[PDB]
Amino acid sequence: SAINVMKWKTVSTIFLVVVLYLIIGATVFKALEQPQEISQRTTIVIQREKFLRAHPCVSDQELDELIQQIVAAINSHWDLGCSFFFAGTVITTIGFGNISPRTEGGKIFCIIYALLGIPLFGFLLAGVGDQLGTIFGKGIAKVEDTFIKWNVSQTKIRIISTIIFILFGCVLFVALPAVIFKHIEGWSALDAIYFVVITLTTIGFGDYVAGGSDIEYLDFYKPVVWFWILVGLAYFAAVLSMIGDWLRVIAKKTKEAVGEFRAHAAEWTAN
Amino acid sequence: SDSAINVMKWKTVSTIFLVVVLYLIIGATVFKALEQPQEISQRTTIVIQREKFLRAHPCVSDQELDELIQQIVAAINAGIIPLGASSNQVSHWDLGCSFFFAGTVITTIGFGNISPRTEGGKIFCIIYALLGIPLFGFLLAGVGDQLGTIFGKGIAKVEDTFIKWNVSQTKIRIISTIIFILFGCVLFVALPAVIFKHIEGWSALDAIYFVVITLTTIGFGDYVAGGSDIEYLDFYKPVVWFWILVGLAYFAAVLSMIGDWLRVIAKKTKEAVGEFRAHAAE
Ligand SMILES: CCCCCCCCCCCCC/C=C/[C@@H](O)[C@H](CO)NC(=O)CCCCCCCCCCCCCCC
Ligand SMILES: *[C@H]1C(=O)N(c2ccc(C(=O)NCc3ccc(Cl)cc3Cl)cc2)C(=O)[C@@H]1C
Ligand SMILES: *[C@H]1C(=O)N(c2ccc(C(=O)NCc3ccc(Cl)cc3Cl)cc2)C(=O)[C@@H]1C
Ligand SMILES: CCCCCCCCCCCCCCCC
Ligand SMILES: CCCCCCCCCCCCCCCC
Ligand SMILES: CCCCCCCCCCCCCCCC
Ligand SMILES: CCCCCCCCCC
Ligand SMILES: CCCCCCCCCC
Ligand SMILES: CCCCCCCCCC
Ligand SMILES: CCCCCCCCCC
Ligand SMILES: CCCCCCCCCC
Ligand SMILES: CCCCCCCCCC
Ligand SMILES: CCCCCCCCCC
Ligand SMILES: CCCCCCCCCC
Ligand SMILES: CCCCCCCCCC
Ligand SMILES: CCCCCCCCCC
Ligand SMILES: CCCCCCCCCC
Ligand SMILES: [K+]
Ligand SMILES: [K+]
Ligand SMILES: [K+]
Ligand SMILES: [K+]
Ligand SMILES: [K+]
């Protein structure tokens, strides 16, 4: 019973931290998106009135009619390339959602496909992460013999190892594919980085999709991006895990800072 | 970290890799078999609606028609409502909406119905994801632990009904797993589905579909609870928030045990291939 009370206090504090995090994020997102949302809000209503006046021969009541059936139409996209990419988007959980099942049977099969594919792909992702782990481990085990030379102690070397990991991982799984996407997809630099992060975190908004545009592309383009999806998902799993590990020590150092502070402040009211 | 096992591991993942490739290949061909027909059924009915007004309004440039379609669908990617009967739209980035969006990012569901457009929004979204996803992982771990300990006490109450009719061991563990999947499906999949059926006005299959697509954190965005311009019950979206929490915990557990079942199946297949190759044509 009492260990469950200690658990409830831990989970409660974590939950409230997450709520506060959402509150901060919400107010910040509003602060950035609303202003430029009006900048884009007037650009379409202007085109409305301006093309109703530039084409007076068109009925104003027939204007909204086309918008109805157009948004209804948003409600070939299904060649082997598209369905294969979609089968990738389900089992990786990267739910871009650009194309989705509309038939009832298609929805049922998508359910079964997800429930079986996500675990199997988890096994694959584990194997890839292990391969990368041993390949990077030999590199850090070779650079530790050239590091213990000019030095005295340790602990600093683990942090240098993590720094090397973050640097090479960022120049191989986020930077280089970003500049390639800049060129092939015609995206901007920040949009390329944005796409990399949103995809490799498995968030997958769908506002930026590599190989999804009406661009020529190469025979070895989308397959290479597939391979990048594999290794990048592994790398981002590791980096997210270790960011969580940093959060652990931060929580511990903050509760010990709180102890240090309350203990150094209680004796001041006494004096 | 060395030795010969790294070859033995490479054979494992490689075979799994080919399996997943095969798994994708099959998955690709079947989806096409269902979605492609109704895609052309609507693809030719709209090009008719195009041409029928392409001839009924020759006063239109028609080359500027699809041009207008360009800017309208591009603005729909930002979620526009260009109407005159309802010449007053609501903001997609108020506190209520932006809170839900910040929820969709840290859970990785990422519905994507509304997305950042400003430069700062994208940069902040990157930082926000990189810090939020692990923290929410801790929260999900705590909720999964709470559900696990409540289920442990629940099965600890029925253990007096086990030490009686045929005393076994593992066969009772499988019943435990059965109880887990059944009750979890009737509380985190079935009940919210019928609620979505009622409030959101979705169909039964669409409700189950939404539940599954969200609790797996896929999140296509074609179905969003509380995402329509409907009144709702003010105490609806918070309840769906709590459902998001407990459902993600439950689905993590269910996916993990599906993987374990796949493991046992894979071992039984590696033994079946041996039995067959050794028995060669009986
Ligand atoms: C950039 C983000 C920074 C976020 C990090 C700031 C810290 C906030 C997160 C703290 C969450 C608790 C973490 C672990 C808690 C205990 O399991 C831990 C076991 O190892 N025990 C203690 O620390 C020894 C003391 C035990 C503390 C119990 C948990 C805290 C409860 C304190 C308040 C009690 C009321 C709770 C209701 C809100
Ligand atoms: C139909 C459609 O969906 N695509 C299309 C086809 C192929 C890709 C693709 O493979 N992108 C690289 C890739 C691979 C796997 C994953 Cl999990 C993600 C990604 Cl980004 C993208 C889009 C089309 O060209 C039409 C629109
Ligand atoms: C603006 C917008 O984004 N929403 C909106 C507001 C709130 C919700 C919501 O909370 N749905 C339940 C929920 C909670 C958390 C998560 Cl991670 C997922 C879900 Cl489904 C949805 C949509 C609006 O009504 C306008 C369009
Ligand atoms: C041995 C690993 C090297 C890491 C780079 C290999 C490819 C990973 C992504 C780079 C290419 C992705 C963009 C697609 C270019 C055709
Ligand atoms: C080194 C392990 C290789 C995997 C052995 C074959 C596994 C194939 C059976 C499980 C794969 C998913 C099948 C789902 C329907 C039975
Ligand atoms: C829905 C996909 C079902 C696919 C079921 C069969 C695919 C995997 C079978 C591979 C069998 C390999 C035997 C391993 C021999 C060592
Ligand atoms: C372990 C289940 C929760 C125990 C405490 C219940 C009331 C606390 C929330 C108000
Ligand atoms: C997903 C379709 C893109 C074209 C081929 C990409 C790789 C095919 C085999 C992995
Ligand atoms: C009518 C809904 C049918 C859902 C079928 C689910 C099958 C799960 C197999 C793992
Ligand atoms: C990753 C989600 C599916 C978990 C089952 C796969 C087991 C190996 C991954 C840890
Ligand atoms: C981002 C602000 C979080 C503050 C942490 C409060 C918890 C204190 C632990 C004793
Ligand atoms: C406050 C929790 C729900 C967040 C969605 C915003 C709408 C609040 C009233 C339903
Ligand atoms: C406001 C645009 C200037 C460049 C982005 C600055 C904001 C970064 C997140 C606070
Ligand atoms: C080009 C700007 C890239 C955004 C900076 C990302 C920093 C991540 C810190 C967590
Ligand atoms: C994943 C569990 C799905 C529950 C089956 C739904 C059956 C509804 C019949 C009324
Ligand atoms: C819902 C479980 C599917 C596997 C993804 C888990 C998190 C992925 C990015 C952290
Ligand atoms: C340690 C390897 C266990 C067997 C490989 C994983 C099987 C994946 C599901 C078919
Ligand atoms: K998604
Ligand atoms: K999406
Ligand atoms: K979308
Ligand atoms: K996800
Ligand atoms: K997703």
Side-chain angles (χ1 to χ4, degrees), chain A residues 21 48 77 102 107 113, chain B residues 23 35 39 83 128 206 223:
Chain A
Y21 191 82
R48 175 158 81 195
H77 296 112
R102 297 271 59 87
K107 295 176 178 175
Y113 198 78
Chain B
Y23 189 80
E35 292 297 328
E39 167 182 26
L83 279 172
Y128 198 78
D206 294 332
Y223 290 95

Side-chain angles (χ1 to χ4, degrees), chain B residues 7-62 64-88 90-164 168-170 172-230 232-278:
Chain B
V7 177
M8 284 63 255
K9 76 177 57 183
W10 195 89
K11 207 277 182 181
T12 292
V13 50
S14 64
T15 55
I16 299 172
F17 166 84
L18 289 176
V19 166
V20 93
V21 172
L22 215 162
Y23 189 80
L24 294 176
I25 292 173
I26 299 186
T29 66
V30 43
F31 276 122
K32 182 199 329 300
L34 303 115
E35 292 297 328
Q36 180 91 318
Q38 274 296 325
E39 167 182 26
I40 68 103
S41 175
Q42 269 67 216
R43 195 107 178 193
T44 64
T45 47
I46 188 60
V47 75
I48 286 173
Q49 300 312 101
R50 175 158 246 163
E51 175 56 37
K52 79 186 305 178
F53 269 167
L54 276 182
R55 55 131 298 269
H57 289 64
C59 51
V60 182
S61 173
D62 305 4
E64 297 181 25
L65 169 70
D66 36 350
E67 179 261 357
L68 184 154
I69 303 307
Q70 293 185 37
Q71 303 109 359
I72 61 181
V73 305
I76 297 178
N77 300 329
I80 54 151
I81 313 97
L83 279 172
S86 61
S87 56
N88 43 263
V90 78
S91 177
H92 296 325
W93 284 108
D94 54 322
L95 256 58
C97 289
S98 52
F99 192 92
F100 151 78
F101 172 83
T104 64
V105 46
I106 71 171
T107 62
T108 68
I109 307 180
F111 285 136
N113 54 318
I114 45 177
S115 312
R117 300 273 62 86
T118 190
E119 290 85 35
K122 293 178 177 71
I123 298 177
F124 179 81
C125 188
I126 295 185
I127 293 171
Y128 198 78
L130 288 177
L131 293 172
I133 296 171
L135 167 71
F136 187 80
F138 293 103
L139 175 59
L140 259 184
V143 171
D145 179 73
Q146 220 68 26
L147 282 184
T149 61
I150 293 171
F151 177 74
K153 305 303 138 300
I155 56 94
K157 301 179 281 75
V158 200
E159 74 95 13
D160 278 20
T161 330
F162 299 155
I163 55 179
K164 313 185 320 301
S168 179
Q169 193 236 317
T170 59
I172 310 182
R173 187 215 70 88
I174 196 58
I175 305 175
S176 309
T177 69
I178 297 169
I179 296 164
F180 172 82
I181 56 103
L182 206 67
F183 284 79
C185 280
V186 310
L187 296 178
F188 311 102
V189 167
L191 174 73
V194 309
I195 307 302
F196 299 146
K197 263 268 304 178
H198 188 268
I199 174 159
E200 291 296 333
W202 299 339
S203 73
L205 170 63
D206 294 332
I208 302 284
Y209 180 69
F210 166 77
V211 169
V212 176
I213 296 300
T214 64
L215 294 188
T216 52
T217 60
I218 300 179
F220 288 143
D222 46 352
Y223 290 95
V224 174
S228 312
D229 258 2
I230 311 187
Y232 301 135
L233 290 175
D234 198 2
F235 45 73
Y236 173 64
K237 295 173 192 158
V239 169
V240 188
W241 264 105
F242 175 78
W243 169 77
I244 285 294
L245 277 186
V246 292
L248 287 180
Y250 177 73
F251 260 65
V254 174
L255 290 170
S256 173
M257 77 163 53
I258 288 176
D260 279 314
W261 304 152
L262 297 176
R263 268 166 283 212
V264 184
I265 292 167
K267 308 321 290 175
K268 169 220 171 193
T269 52
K270 291 230 181 185
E271 67 93 348
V273 297
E275 187 78 8
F276 160 72
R277 298 173 98 95

